[PDB]
Amino acid sequence: IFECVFSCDIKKEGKPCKPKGEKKCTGGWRCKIKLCLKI
């Protein structure tokens, strides 16, 4: 899995990462402030 943290925070995440614990967001989704936004 592509590491990061994925707390979906702009700094814990905040780029294309891997939604851990998310039901909607899939891998390759950039957390961007509000939510996960696929790249």
Curated annotation (Swiss-Prot):
Q: What does this protein do?
A: Inhibits voltage-gated calcium channels (Cav) in rat cerebellar granule cells. Has insecticidal activity to crickets (Acheta domesticus). Is not toxic to mice.
Quick one: where is this thing mainly located?
A: secreted
Classification from the root reads: Eukaryota, Metazoa, Ecdysozoa, Arthropoda, Chelicerata
Q: Which family would the database say this protein is a member of?
A: Belongs to the neurotoxin 12 (Hwtx-2) family. 06 (TXP1) subfamily.
Which pairs of Cys residues are joined through disulfide bonds in the record? 4-17, 8-31, 25-36
* GO MF, one example: toxin activity
Q: What is this protein called?
A: Omega-theraphotoxin-Ba1b
Q: Name one GO cellular component term.
A: extracellular region
Name where it's found: Secreted
Pfam family for this entry, one: Toxin_20
Tissue expression, as annotated, is: Expressed by the venom gland.
- For this UniProt record, give its keywords in alphabetical order, as a comma-separated list: Calcium channel impairing toxin, Disulfide bond, Ion channel impairing toxin, Neurotoxin, Secreted, Toxin, Voltage-gated calcium channel impairing toxin
Q: Which source organism does the UniProt entry give?
A: Brachypelma albiceps (Mexican golden redrump tarantula)
The miscellaneous remark of the record is: Negative results: does not inhibit insect and mice voltage-gated sodium channels (para/tipE, Nav1.2/SCN2A, Nav1.5/SCN5A).
